[PDB]
């Protein structure tokens, strides 16, 4: 359970690295803007597809069954 | 920025403190201040004129006890300052107060002066970075991992039912009654005097509390148990003398389900629960009855769950499914919830900043507590 | 027992040296004085650490068993 907890912590930190990305509007070209926004959208969709995979759902289910609600609630909420 | 927030559940009976992330409250200890009543004569005596936490416990006989907060309101603020300072002592949490944020859990419908003075004490005396008053029911639901339910938290000093549905609390449905475990222990002391054992002294009162812990059960039928003969379980005092309880064993906790016994015309615990649910809207009632979460130390009485189920079944509408969920860690549920909530980065948005409090004062904390 | 008592006498005298360091504030810079007090902080914690060492505690227990109560009492309380 502790190993799964630390793994979910790593997952949450990695997801927050991508979800919290923000671009300064003033800097760079609008071409860079469109590239940034589409790349971010593709990354989020890939992350979402990974998140719905049976592995992550199984991990969350194991953590719930062990009453380790820290990681599960954080993953459901902190990721944004 | 800061490294880690500190969760402090300042329950009237026991104060439970630890760091956010820890699965168990690392440092939980009784919520009273003990001062020596006798005279010091021989050098090399116990140091200090104030005793808190375990050190008071090993030397309980020497000390006069003083509870700082009674029914969830801090009557003595200097003592509460001292115990909060003890929470940061080298014994517990061994860290500076100005470095870590703090989450504090207060009882619902408490006086406004209580929360504002509390925020004052944390922000001036301790110079904490950020503070967040919180409701115990929300944390209990977080710890159980539920967004719905009715939290019936019966701590030492106060009992209260809060209905929460899908992360929304109905504030007008929150029922609070001051009858709680400490009142049960007072009633038990009175009955033990009636049986012929006196515990007038302050330190002795903790013995009455331990008696309540060890040998007290809630009968399914109080009257049928009353007419029948008791078992008269004996309890050994710390010195060695025994005391025989008998009929007071079950008549004591029945104070919770009938406050008429002490003489207070207040709602019973089952009445608190059913009134809280019924006071809500119709559509949710069934789901609320399907989800009942028990918290607080007073819920650990033997037979509490079954008696409560019988009472709510009698008072609830017929053919309704009642399911009372009693986790194993009821006593430390609220702190675990506080830890979970603090661990969330969203906590960064709820708490009040020291600069914000200084700029706005009590208005800021009053806004960001409800 | 007399040897260990003399050792305890040495210990209490040495600890009295550290506990009774009183500096003239006029002599030295502010840095010198604050450094002196911080070193005193850490030194008194080190003396607490030494006091709890098993060998010294065994010495005190031996003196107690030999009923040289004067040395044990002086070590416990008179150190300041």
UniProtKB/Swiss-Prot annotation, chains A, C:
It is found in: Cytoplasm, Cytoskeleton. Disulfide bonds: none annotated. Changing residue 23 to L: In SMALED1; slight increased BICD2-binding. Cytoplasmic dynein 1 acts as a motor for the intracellular retrograde motility of vesicles and organelles along microtubules. Dynein has ATPase activity; the force-producing power stroke is thought to occur on release of ADP. Plays a role in mitotic spindle assembly and metaphase plate congression. It is linked to Charcot-Marie-Tooth disease, axonal, type 2O: An axonal form of Charcot-Marie-Tooth disease, a disorder of the peripheral nervous system, characterized by progressive weakness and atrophy, initially of the peroneal muscles and later of the distal muscles of the arms. Charcot-Marie-Tooth disease is classified in two main groups on the basis of electrophysiologic properties and histopathology: primary peripheral demyelinating neuropathies (designated CMT1 when they are dominantly inherited) and primary peripheral axonal neuropathies (CMT2). Dynein heavy chains probably consist of an N-terminal stem (which binds cargo and interacts with other dynein components), and the head or motor domain. The motor contains six tandemly-linked AAA domains in the head, which form a ring. A stalk-like structure (formed by two of the coiled coil domains) protrudes between AAA 4 and AAA 5 and terminates in a microtubule-binding site. A seventh domain may also contribute to this ring; it is not clear whether the N-terminus or the C-terminus forms this extra domain. Belongs to the dynein heavy chain family. Homodimer. The cytoplasmic dynein 1 complex consists of two catalytic heavy chains (HCs) and a number of non-catalytic subunits presented by intermediate chains (ICs), light intermediate chains (LICs) and light chains (LCs); the composition seems to vary in respect to the IC, LIC and LC composition. The heavy chain homodimer serves as a scaffold for the probable homodimeric assembly of the respective non-catalytic subunits. The ICs and LICs bind directly to the HC dimer and dynein LCs assemble on the IC dimer. Interacts with DYNC1LI1; DYNC1LI1 and DYNC1LI2 bind mutually exclusive to DYNC1H1. This is Cytoplasmic dynein 1 heavy chain 1. It comes from Homo sapiens (Human). The chain holds residues 242 to 321 of 4646 of the full protein.
Curated annotation (Swiss-Prot), chain B:
Keywords: Acetylation, ATP-binding, Cytoplasm, Cytoskeleton, Nucleotide-binding. This is Alpha-centractin. It is found in: Cytoplasm, Cytoskeleton; Cytoplasm, Cytoskeleton, Microtubule organizing center, Centrosome; Cytoplasm, Cell cortex. It comes from Sus scrofa (Pig). Part of the ACTR1A/ACTB filament around which the dynactin complex is built. The dynactin multiprotein complex activates the molecular motor dynein for ultra-processive transport along microtubules. InterPro entries: Actin (IPR004000), Actin/actin-like_CS (IPR020902), ATPase_NBD (IPR043129). PANTHER family: ACTIN. It comes from the Eukaryota. Its main location: cytoplasm.
């Amino acid at each position: 359970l502790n190993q799964l907890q630390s793994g979910v912590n790593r997952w949450i930190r990695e997801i927050q690295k991508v979800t919290k990305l923000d671009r300064d509007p003033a800097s760079g070209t609008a071409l860079q803007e469109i590239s940034f926004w589409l790349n971010l959208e593709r990354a989020l969709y890939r992350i979402q597809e990974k998140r719905e995979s049976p592995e992550v759902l199984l991990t969350l289910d194991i953590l719930k069954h062990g009453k380790r609600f820290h990681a599960t609630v954080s993953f459901d909420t902190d990721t944004g | 920025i800061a490294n880690q927030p500190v969760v402090i559940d300042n329950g009237s009976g026991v104060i439970k403190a630890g760091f956010a992330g820890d699965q168990i409250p690392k440092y939980c200890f009784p919520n009273y201040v003990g001062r020596p009543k006798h005279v010091r004569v021989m050098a090399g005596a116990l140091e200090g004129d104030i005793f808190i936490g375990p050190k008071a416990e090993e030397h309980r006989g020497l000390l006069s006890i003083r509870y700082p907060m009674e029914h969830g309101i801090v009557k003595d603020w200097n003592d509460m300052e001292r115990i909060w300072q003890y929470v940061y002592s080298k014994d517990q949490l061994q860290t500076f107060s100005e470095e870590h944020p703090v989450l504090l859990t207060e009882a619902p419908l408490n006086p406004r002066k209580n929360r504002e003075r509390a925020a004052e004490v944390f922000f001036e005396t301790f110079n904490v970075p950020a503070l967040f008053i919180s409701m115990q029911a929300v944390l209990s639901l977080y710890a159980t991992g539920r967004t719905t339910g009715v939290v019936l938290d019966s701590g030492d000093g106060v009992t209260h039912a809060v209905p929460i549905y899908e992360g929304f609390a109905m504030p007008h449905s929150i029922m609070r009654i001051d009858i709680a475990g400490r009142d049960v222990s007072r009633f038990l002391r009175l009955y033990l005097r009636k049986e012929g054992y006196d515990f007038h002294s302050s330190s002795e009162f903790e013995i009455v509390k331990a008696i309540k812990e060890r040998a007290c059960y809630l009968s399914i039928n109080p009257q049928k148990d009353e007419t029948l003969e008791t078992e008269k379980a004996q309890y050994y005092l710390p010195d060695g003398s025994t005391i025989e309880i008998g009929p007071s064993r079950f008549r004591a906790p029945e104070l919770l389900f009938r406050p008429d016994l002490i003489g207070e015309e207040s709602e019973g615990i089952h009445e608190v629960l059913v009134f809280a649910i019924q006071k809500s809207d119709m559509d949710l009632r069934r789901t609320l009855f399907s989800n009942i979460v028990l918290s607080g130390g007073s819920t650990l009485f033997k037979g509490f769950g079954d008696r409560l189920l019988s009472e709510v079944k009698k008072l609830a509408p017929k053919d309704v499914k009642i399911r009372i969920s009693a986790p194993q860690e009821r006593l430390y549920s609220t702190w675990i919830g506080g830890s979970i909530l603090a661990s969330l980065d969203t906590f960064k948005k709820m708490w009040v900043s020291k600069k914000e409090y200084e700029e706005d004062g009590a208005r800021s904390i009053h806004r960001k507590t409800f």
